[PDB]
Amino acid sequence: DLYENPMGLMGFEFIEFASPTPGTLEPIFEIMGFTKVATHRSKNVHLYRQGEINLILNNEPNSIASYFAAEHGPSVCGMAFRVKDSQKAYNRALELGAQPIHIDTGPMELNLPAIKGIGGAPLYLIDRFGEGSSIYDIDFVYLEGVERNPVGAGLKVIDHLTHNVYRGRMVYWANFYEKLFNFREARYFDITSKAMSAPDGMIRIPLNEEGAGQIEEFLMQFNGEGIQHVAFLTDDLVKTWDALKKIGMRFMTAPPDTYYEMLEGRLPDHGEPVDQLQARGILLDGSSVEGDKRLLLQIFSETLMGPVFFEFIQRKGDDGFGEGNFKALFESIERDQVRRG
Amino acid sequence: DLYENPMGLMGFEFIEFASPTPGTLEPIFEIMGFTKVATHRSKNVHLYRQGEINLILNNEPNSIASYFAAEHGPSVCGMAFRVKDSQKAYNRALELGAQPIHIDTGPMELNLPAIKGIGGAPLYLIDRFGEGSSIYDIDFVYLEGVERNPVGAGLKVIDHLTHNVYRGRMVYWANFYEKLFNFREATSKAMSAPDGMIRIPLNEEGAGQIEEFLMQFNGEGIQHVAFLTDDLVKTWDALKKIGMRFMTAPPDTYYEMLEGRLPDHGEPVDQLQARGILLDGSSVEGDKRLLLQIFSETLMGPVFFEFIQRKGDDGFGEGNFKALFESIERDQVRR
Amino acid sequence: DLYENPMGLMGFEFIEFASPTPGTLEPIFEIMGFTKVATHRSKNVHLYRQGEINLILNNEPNSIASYFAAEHGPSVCGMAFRVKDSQKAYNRALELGAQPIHIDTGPMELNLPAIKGIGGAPLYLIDRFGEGSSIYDIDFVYLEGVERNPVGAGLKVIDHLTHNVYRGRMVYWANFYEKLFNFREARYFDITSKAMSAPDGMIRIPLNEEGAGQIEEFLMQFNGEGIQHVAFLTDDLVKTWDALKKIGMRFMTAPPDTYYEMLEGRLPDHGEPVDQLQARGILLDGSSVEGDKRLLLQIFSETLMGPVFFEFIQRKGDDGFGEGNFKALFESIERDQVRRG
Amino acid sequence: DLYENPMGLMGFEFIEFASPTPGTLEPIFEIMGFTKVATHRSKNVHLYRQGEINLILNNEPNSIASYFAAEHGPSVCGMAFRVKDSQKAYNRALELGAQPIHIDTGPMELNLPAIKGIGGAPLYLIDRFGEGSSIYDIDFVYLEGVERNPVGAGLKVIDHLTHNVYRGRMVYWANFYEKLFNFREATSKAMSAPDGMIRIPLNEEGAGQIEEFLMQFNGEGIQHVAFLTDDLVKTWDALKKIGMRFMTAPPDTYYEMLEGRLPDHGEPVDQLQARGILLDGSSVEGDKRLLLQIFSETLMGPVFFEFIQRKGDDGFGEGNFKALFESIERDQVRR
Numbered sequence A, C: 001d002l003y004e005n006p007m008g009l010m011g012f013e014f015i016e017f018a019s020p021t022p023g024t025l026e027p028i029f030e031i032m033g034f035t036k037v038a039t040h041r042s043k044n045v046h047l048y049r050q051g052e053i054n055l056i057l058n059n060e061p062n063s064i065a066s067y068f069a070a071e072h073g074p075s076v077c078g079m080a081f082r083v084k085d086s087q088k089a090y091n092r093a094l095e096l097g098a099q100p101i102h103i104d105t106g107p108m109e110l111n112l113p114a115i116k117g118i119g120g121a122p123l124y125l126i127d128r129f130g131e132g133s134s135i136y137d138i139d140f141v142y143l144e145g146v147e148r149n150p151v152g153a154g155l156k157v158i159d160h161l162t163h164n165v166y167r168g169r170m171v172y173w174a175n176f177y178e179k180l181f182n183f184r185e186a187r188y189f190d191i192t193s194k195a196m197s198a199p200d201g202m203i204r205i206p207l208n209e210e211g212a213g214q215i216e217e218f219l220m221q222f223n224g225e226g227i228q229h230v231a232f233l234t235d236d237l238v239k240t241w242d243a244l245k246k247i248g249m250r251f252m253t254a255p256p257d258t259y260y261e262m263l264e265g266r267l268p269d270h271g272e273p274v275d276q277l278q279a280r281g282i283l284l285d286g287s288s289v290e291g292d293k294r295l296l297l298q299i300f301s302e303t304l305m306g307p308v309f310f311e312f313i314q315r316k317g318d319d320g321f322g323e324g325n326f327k328a329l330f331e332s333i334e335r336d337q338v339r340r341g
Numbered sequence B, D: 001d002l003y004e005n006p007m008g009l010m011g012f013e014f015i016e017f018a019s020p021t022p023g024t025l026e027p028i029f030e031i032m033g034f035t036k037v038a039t040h041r042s043k044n045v046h047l048y049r050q051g052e053i054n055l056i057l058n059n060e061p062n063s064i065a066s067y068f069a070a071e072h073g074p075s076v077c078g079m080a081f082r083v084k085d086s087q088k089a090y091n092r093a094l095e096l097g098a099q100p101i102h103i104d105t106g107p108m109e110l111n112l113p114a115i116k117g118i119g120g121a122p123l124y125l126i127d128r129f130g131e132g133s134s135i136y137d138i139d140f141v142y143l144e145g146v147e148r149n150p151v152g153a154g155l156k157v158i159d160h161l162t163h164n165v166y167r168g169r170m171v172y173w174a175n176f177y178e179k180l181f182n183f184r185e186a187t188s189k190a191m192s193a194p195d196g197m198i199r200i201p202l203n204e205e206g207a208g209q210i211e212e213f214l215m216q217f218n219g220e221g222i223q224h225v226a227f228l229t230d231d232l233v234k235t236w237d238a239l240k241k242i243g244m245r246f247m248t249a250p251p252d253t254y255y256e257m258l259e260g261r262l263p264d265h266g267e268p269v270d271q272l273q274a275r276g277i278l279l280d281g282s283s284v285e286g287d288k289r290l291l292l293q294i295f296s297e298t299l300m301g302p303v304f305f306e307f308i309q310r311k312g313d314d315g316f317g318e319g320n321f322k323a324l325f326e327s328i329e330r331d332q333v334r335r
C-alpha cells in the first residue's frame, strides 16, 4: 500500500493474447512452461496457467481482440487489473475521461468492463478472483482430469509489462495511469524510459520512447504502440532456466565472457555464483552500498510473437529493471572486440 | 422424461416479484415460510428461499420489474425456466420468433437471457444451478452465518403456476408454450412441459373470478403460484403458526360428501376439516389417485398461493369446483 | 389552445399500417380515396395521402410494425403526434414514466422517437412537418410525375381514432394520456366510453370498454387492445360519399326508412336534406336548443382490415361522436320490425 | 471520371474541427474568410462556409469530437466524403473490414454513418447535398437573414488534405484508401480518389517537421487542409485584409531562380514576391503545367492551411522543397 489507491488495485489479473495467424501463440506458451487449463463456456478462447499467472488466448473471430491482432500481429491484446470494486473503478475511470471498450457478452456470462488503453488494447477492471470465485470458475470450463494449478518452470506472477510508445507519448500515457489509477513514476532512465508503478506495489508498467533504434523498429513492426515485453517473476532464475531449457525455450545469446569477469568491479560482493550465471547467459544488476545487497537477475527470450519478447526475472532487493546491463553490455562487447580485432 | 425436450427444460428455477409500494412484499414471503437468505451484490434485489424454491424480490428502481409493478401492482413479474444450454435455447426461441427482453446487467454480473412471456413479464432461461454454481452463489451475497438451506414450513418445489388470460388468448399462449418449448396439453388448459416438472395452466372467463383478476391485475399474468409439500397437515400447522391467512373453510357439508364422491379416500377427515383443506382425485381399480390442497387469501393484489400435496393425482383440484358448489346448496337448504 | 399543452401538441401527423398478409391494405386505401404518393429511401414502406391525411404502409420484415401485425392482423400499428419540440416532449414523457420504443434507423435517415402506446403500438413524437421540411420530404422519395397533394374523395384530416380496451383499462389509458400529454375527458357515454381530447383541440382518442357485445368480439378478433375505427373528416359528407362510392367503397347497410322519418322529432329543424341522407345511409346527430344548431353527419364502413372499420364524418357545430345514433337506431329497427312482424 | 468508383465518391462534403479551449477555433475560421452561417438544431455545433467549402465546428461536450480534441488539441477531428448511396457504401466498407464509429444522434436528427479513419477520426459518408437537400438544410438552423452562400476571399473547394502518419504507416493508410475506396497512388504518397476530386497525400519522417507534427499533434492526423482558389493574388489581398498570418516569404534568391527553373512561366514575379507566394510546375512542348501556392502559420496546434491555384499542374508544390533549399544557400552565401 505505497500511496493512495482510489481504484482499489490489487495486482495483475490476466494478460490477453491474439494472433492473425493460428498456431503461432499455442507453441510459445508451451516453451515458457505455461499449460492449457480451461476453455470458455461459449467462445473459442482458452486459459493457460503457470503459478499465479493467468494468460487468455482469444481466438474469437470478429471479436475485439482479433481486430487488434489484425492490425498488430501476434500480440498482447488485452490487460486486466484486479480491483476491490470494479463498478466503482469503472465509473470513476469514465468520470475522469476514459473511453469505454464494449466487450460483447454472451448469455449466462459475465459482463467484463474495459476501457481503451495502450494501442487501443482494452484494460479490464476485475473484482472477482480467488478459487471458486474467479472469472475462470464462472466463465471457463476446465479440462477433464487436467490440473488447475500447474507450476511449470516456476514462474509466479507477472512482474511487469513494458510498453513502447511513439516519440512524445511517454508523458501522455504516464498521465493516463497517473490520472486514472494514481500511478507514479518510480524510476527514470536516460540511455528514455519512465517506470510507472501502481499504488499496490505490484502493477509495474514501464513506458519507452526512442531515432533509428530498438524501439523505433518495434513501432514499425508492431504497427503502433504496444507491449514490448512481458516480465514473469520466478523464485529461482537458474532453476527456472533449466526447467525452461528442458522444454525448448530459446534465449538471447549470452553476453561475452568479458561481461562476467567485470561483475566483481560493477557490483562488489554480490554473492552470486558467477559460474552458474555464465553457464546460462543470465544477467545481473543492482547496487552494493554499506552492507545492503539489492540485486536483480534477469534473462530475455528472443522475439517470439512478432516483435514481442519475454523476460524471466528474480529480484533480490533491487526494485529496478536491469537498466545497468545496457552500459555493462556495451563495455563488454567493447573489451571483447578489442581482445580479438 | 415424458417426451422430447428441444429446449432442455429442467424445472422452474426462480420466480420474481415486484411491488410499487415498499414493505408490502416482505411480510408476505415471511408468513409463507420463506427466509431472506441473500442480497444482490449491487442491485436492491433479494433472494427468499424455502425448500428448493427461489423467490427473487426485485426492488430495483427505473428497471424492468418496477415498470411492470407500476402497471400491475404487487405481482409475479418474472419467471425463470431452468435449462441445460441457455445459449442454444435463447437463439432457438429467437429464431422461432420469440421476442427478447433485455435486462440491464451491471459490470461483473451475469447477463441473464430472457424472452417476453405472459403479460410482458420476462421469461428467463437459466443454465447455472445447484450449490456453488447457481446464479445466487455468483451474483448474490448470502447473509453471513445464516443457514442458506432453510426448510421452513416444508414447502419443497414450485408445483405449478397458472395464468389468467383474456378471452380467446388461451390458444395464443398454448401455442407460445407449444412452439417454443414443446409443452403439451395434458375453462382451463393444463400445459405441461417435456421435463415433467413445469406445469402452466391457462384460464379464461362473464363477470366471474377471472374477469375480476384481469381487472384487478391490469392484464394477463400469474394468478396463483402453487408450492408442493409432503405433509400438508404438517405444513398447515407450521404456516398458521407464523401468520398465514387462508381462504376460509368449506361448509361441513363438503365433508359429508367426501366418502360419497371419493369412496374410501382414507384421509383423516377431522384433521382436514379442522384446517379447511380440500380433497380431490379418483378411486378406480383400488388405485386411489388423490390430492390435498388449500389456498390463501389474495395477498398480492388479486394474486394468491396454493399449497398442495399430491397422493398420486396429477390434477389440480378441479372437481373441487362442482364439489364446493354442491356443498353451498346443501348448506343453504339446511339454512 | 383549449388548456395547458406541455408537450406542444399540434394535431395528428400520421397513422401507420401493417398486415401479416400482403395485398390486404393497398386495395383498402384505394377504395377510401387515398393515393400512393411516395416510397421510403431504404425501407419497404410507402406513403398514401389524401387532403392532409398521411398514412404510412409499413411492409418492412422483422420490423416493429410486422411484429405488431403478426399478433393483431391487419391493423393500425402506429400513431404519430405533431409536436413543437420533439426532444423536449420525448424527454418529458420518459421522465413521467413512459417506456421508449426503439425504431431502428438506417444510415442517412431520421431517428424517429416513439413511446409504447395502446396495444404496444408506438406513439411517435414528430417536430418536423410542412412542405419541404416534413419527414416525407427528408426520408421518403416521391413517385415520378405523380402529384404530392392528392385530394381524392375530399377527406381532410384525421378527426379521431377510437380504441377498444379490456374491461377496466379505460381508466388506465385515460390516465396515460392525462398524465403524459394533458388530455382531458371531454365527454362520457353510458350505453361505456371516455372521449379524451388533446389540449390542441384536434387529437381526439375515444376509449371503449364492454359483456358479450361489439367490443368484446373486437378484442377477441384483434388479439388485444387496439384502434377500433379511424375517423376521417370531410368538408361535405354527401359529396365525399358519391366520390367514395365511385371508387368501390362499401358502407354499412343503411338504417330502416323508419330512422329517417323520426329525424324531425329527434332533432327538430336540423335543416339537413333528408332525401339526400336517406339515399346514402348517412346518419345524423346533435342537439337543437334556442336557435343554436350543433349537428354531425357520419357514416361507417364495414370492417375492412380484420375487425377495424372507418368513419367519414362532417361536423356542423356538434363536437360529439354520433352517440345518439345508438338509441336512435334501436327505436328505428324496433318500429320497423313492429310494422312487419 | 478517371476509373471505377465502387463507393460512388463525389468529392469532399465537409471537414469537422474541435478544440478543448473555447474561443480559439472561431478566430481562425474568420481570418481565413469563412462565415458562420448556421447553427445545429440542438447540439452546440456550427457551420462555417466559404465558396462550396463546409466547415463544421463541433463544440459538443462528452462527445466523439471532444474526446478527440482532448487528445490532439485544436484539430481536424472528422472528414466527410460525399457519396451517391451512403447505405451501400457503409455496408460495403464494413463487409470489407472497416470499423464503424457510432455518432450519437438526437431525436429527429440524421443518423450519420462513419467508419474510423486517420488517427481515429470519423470518416463520414454523406449522400445528402446541394441546396434544400443537404444535411445543413435539415439539421442546421441558418442565421435568419444571413447570406447563406458567402464567397469571402474566393476560396472555392477543398483541394486536398494531407495526413502525417508514423514511420511505416504510409502503406497501411494507402491500403486503407485502396481497399475501401479504390484510391490510386498518382517521403510522400499522393492518394487520389476515383472521382477526380478527393486527394489525400500521406507523409512520413529523423527529427524533421513531420516528426514535430506527430509529437505536437499526439498521433496521426491531418497536417494541412488546402483550399483551392481561382486568383491567388486576389485571394491574398482579401485574406490579408482580414488578418491572415502566412509563413514568411522566401528570400529573393528564390525569385532569381524562377525563370531558371520554370523557363517562361509568365507569372508577374513582382506581384508574387510582394506576397511570398510560391510557384511550381513544368514547361515542356510549350505546355506550361504550373501552380501557385502559399501556406499559413501553424494556427491550430501544428495544423495549418494551404491556399493553392492550379494553372494546369496536378501536383502539390513538391519541387518547392529543393527550390527553397537552394534559395537559402544562395542567400546564406551572399550573407
Ligand SMILES: Cc1ccccc1-n1c(=O)c2c(C)c(C(=O)C3=C(O)CCCC3=O)ccc2n(C)c1=O
Binding pocket: A160, A162, A189, A193, A195, A206, A207, A208, A214, A229, A252, A283, A300, A311, A321, A322, A323, A325, A326, A329
Ligand atoms: C533483449 C534485448 C535485445 C536487443 C537489445 C537490447 C535488449 N535488452 C533489453 O531489451 C533490455 C530491457 C528491455 C530491459 C528492461 O526490461 C527495461 C524495462 O523493463 C523498463 C525500463 C527500460 C528497460 O530497459 C533491461 C535490460 C535489457 N537488456 C540488457 C537488453 O539487452
Ligand SMILES: Cc1ccccc1-n1c(=O)c2c(C)c(C(=O)C3=C(O)CCCC3=O)ccc2n(C)c1=O
Binding pocket: B160, B162, B188, B201, B203, B209, B224, B226, B247, B278, B295, B306, B316, B317, B318, B320, B321, B324
Ligand atoms: C374460486 C376461488 C375463490 C377464492 C379463492 C380461491 C378460489 N379457488 C381457487 O382459486 C381454486 C384454484 C385456483 C384451483 C387451481 O389451482 C387450478 C389449477 O391450479 C389449474 C387448473 C384450474 C384451477 O382452478 C383449484 C381449486 C380452487 N378452488 C376450489 C377455489 O375455491
Ligand SMILES: Cc1ccccc1-n1c(=O)c2c(C)c(C(=O)C3=C(O)CCCC3=O)ccc2n(C)c1=O
Binding pocket: C160, C162, C189, C193, C195, C206, C207, C208, C214, C229, C252, C283, C300, C311, C321, C322, C323, C325, C326, C329
Ligand atoms: C358501425 C357499427 C357496427 C355495428 C354496431 C354498431 C356500429 N356503430 C358504431 O360502431 C358506432 C360508433 C363507433 C360511433 C362512434 O364513433 C363512437 C366514438 O367514436 C367514441 C364514443 C363511442 C362511439 O360510439 C358512433 C355511432 C356508431 N353507430 C351508430 C353504430 O351503429
Ligand SMILES: Cc1ccccc1-n1c(=O)c2c(C)c(C(=O)C3=C(O)CCCC3=O)ccc2n(C)c1=O
Binding pocket: D160, D162, D188, D201, D203, D209, D224, D226, D247, D278, D295, D306, D316, D317, D318, D320, D321, D324
Ligand atoms: C516546410 C514548411 C515549414 C513550415 C511551413 C510550411 C512548410 N512547407 C510546407 O508545409 C509545404 C507543403 C505542406 C506542401 C504540400 O502541400 C504537399 C502536399 O500538399 C502533399 C505532398 C507533399 C507536400 O509537401 C508543399 C510545399 C510546402 N512548402 C514549400 C513548405 O515550406
Ligand SMILES: [Co+2]
Binding pocket: A160, A162, A229, A231, A311, A321
Ligand atoms: Co523488463
Ligand SMILES: [Co+2]
Binding pocket: B160, B162, B226, B306, B316
Ligand atoms: Co392450482
Ligand SMILES: [Co+2]
Binding pocket: C160, C162, C229, C231, C311, C321
Ligand atoms: Co367515431
Ligand SMILES: [Co+2]
Binding pocket: D160, D162, D226, D306, D316
Ligand atoms: Co498541399
